[PDB]
């Protein structure tokens, strides 16, 4: 099955998922000089006050924090979006070394990691119907750099010891994802895909310009997770990023002058 190694990683994925070589694949390099300010962008609204997390899972690729999305709670709207999109999960991608780890890049610069807050368009009723639609998802992407600690990340870091291997999961309630957001909501936006198989082309990407800082100790704990399941040879969970894909016929729009 797919992964991030030599024989099953991103260069192989097109075999089982031919959309890998599609017209609106993610991530991409954000050329900041080529991105155009768009004054028609409405203000971005991130309303996470009533977010309710359910659990955290190691899926053998990364860890997912999954939210109860049964009520109208944790909504992203505005900016490039029409209508309302509801938070269902967040996930990270990171490196073996601080010099790499992010999926999107900014003028070719790789950040130490990247966080994705995944939301579905409530016009489509649930996540599974939404991913069948070209406007079904909005992913808020946030870069992480190594420096000062992020206090609001520490609850995630501490729970990782309990989900070390593939297939392990834990309850994970009352996690507030507002504690993972930088000060500025300045962003770039473009139409793209999920960055893991099945690579579906359903996503409006909204990538924040301002990174959050996390400490070296916090990201070292991410690197202690395992790809393998319990009782197979230990392969550390690192470098679970897909590299930048061709931009094709797309334009990246900036929300800021
Ligand atoms: Zn992701």
> Peptide bond before 101: cis, by omega within 30 degrees of 0?
no
Q: Which helix (H) or strand (E) holds 156?
A: helix 154-159
Pair 225, 237: CB distance under 8 Å: yes
Overall size of the chain counted in residues: 257
- 27: nearest Cα among 250, 223, 254, 184: 250
How far apart are the C-alpha atoms of 108 and 111, rounded to whole Å?
A: 10
What are the helix and strand counts (H, E) for the chain?
3, 15
Pair 216, 98: CB distance under 8 Å: yes
Q: How far is the CA of 134 from the centre of ligand 1 (A)?
A: 18
Q: How far is the CA of 45 from the centre of ligand 1 (A)?
A: 21
Q: How many domains does the chain have?
A: 1
N-to-C CA span, the chain? 44
Q: How far is the CA of 10 from the centre of ligand 1 (A)?
A: 14
Instruction: State both tokens at 17.
Output: 């998922």
User: Which of 70-102 are b and which e, b meaning 16 or more Cβ less than 10 Å from the residue's Cβ?
Assistant: eeebbbbbbbbbeebbbbbbbbbbbbeebebbb
How far apart are the C-alpha atoms of 56 and 66, rounded to whole Å?
A: 6
Local structure of 158: helix, strand or coil: helix
In the PDB record, what is the listed experimental method? X-ray
User: What are the C-alpha distances in Å from 71 to residues 65, 67, 74, 84?
Assistant: 17, 11, 9, 13
Q: Which DSSP symbol is given to 73?
A: -
How far apart are the C-alpha atoms of 129 and 28, rounded to whole Å?
A: 25
List the CATH number of the domain containing 112: 3.10.200.10
Instruction: State both tokens at 123.
Output: 């016009």
Alpha carbon 27 to chain centroid, angstroms: 10
Local structure of 240: helix, strand or coil: coil
Pair 113, 93: CB distance under 8 Å: yes
Pair 212, 180: CB distance under 8 Å: yes
Q: How far is the CA of 116 from the centre of ligand 1 (A)?
A: 5
Instruction: State both tokens at 236.
Output: 């550390």
Return the bridge partners of 47, or none.
Answer: 75
Instruction: State both tokens at 141.
Output: 């992407």
- 35: nearest Cα among 201, 211, 207: 207
Q: How far is the CA of 34 from the centre of ligand 1 (A)?
A: 25
Strands (E) in 8-84, as ranges, are: 29-30, 36-37, 44-47, 53-58, 63-67, 75-78
How far apart are the C-alpha atoms of 116 and 158, rounded to whole Å?
A: 19
Provide the residue range defining the domain that includes 136. 1-257
Q: Provide φ and ψ at 159, rounded to 5°.
A: -85, -15
Neighbours of ion ligand 1 (CB under 5 A): 91, 116
- Resolution of this PDB entry, in A? 1.5
Give the position of tokens 């998922």: 17
- 160: nearest Cα among 221, 84, 79: 221
Pair 191, 24: CB distance under 8 Å: yes
Would residue 61 show up in a list of annotated catalytic residues for this protein?
yes
Alpha carbon 94 to chain centroid, angstroms: 11
Give the position of tokens 């709670």: 73
User: Which residue out of 61, 93, 116, 119 is catalytically annotated?
Assistant: 61
Q: What is the dihedral of CA 173, 179, 184, 187, to 10 degrees?
A: -40
């Amino acid at each position: 099955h797919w992964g991030y190694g030599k024989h099953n990683g991103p260069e192989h994925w097109h075999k089982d998922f031919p959309i890998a070589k599609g017209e609106r694949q993610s991530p991409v390099d954000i050329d900041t000089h080529t991105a155009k300010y768009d004054p028609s962008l409405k203000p971005l609204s991130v309303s996470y006050d009533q977010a309710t997390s359910l659990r955290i899972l190691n899926n053998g690729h990364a860890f997912n924090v999954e939210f109860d999305d049964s009520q109208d709670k944790a909504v992203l709207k505005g900016g490039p979006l029409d209508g309302t999109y509801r938070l269902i999960q967040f996930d990270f991608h990171w490196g073996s070394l601080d010099g790499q780890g992010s999926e999107h890049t900014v003028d070719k610069k790789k950040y130490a990691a990247e966080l994705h807050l995944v939301h579905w368009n409530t016009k489509y009723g649930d996540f599974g119907k939404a991913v069948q639609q070209p406007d079904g998802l909005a992913v808020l992407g946030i870069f992480l750099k190594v420096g000062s600690a992020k206090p609001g990340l520490q609850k995630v870091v501490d729970v990782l010891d309990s989900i070390k291997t593939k297939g392990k999961s834990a309850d994970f309630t009352n996690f507030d994802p507002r504690g993972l957001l930088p000060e500025s909501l300045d962003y770039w936006t473009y139409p793209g895909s999920l960055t893991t198989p099945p690579l579906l082309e359903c996503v409006t990407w909204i990538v924040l310009k301002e990174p959050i800082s996390v400490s070296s100790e916090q990201v070292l704990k991410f690197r202690k997770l395992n790809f393998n399941g319990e009782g197979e040879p230990e392969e550390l969970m690192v470098d679970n990023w897909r590299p930048a894909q061709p931009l094709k016929n797309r334009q990246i729009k900036a929300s800021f002058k």
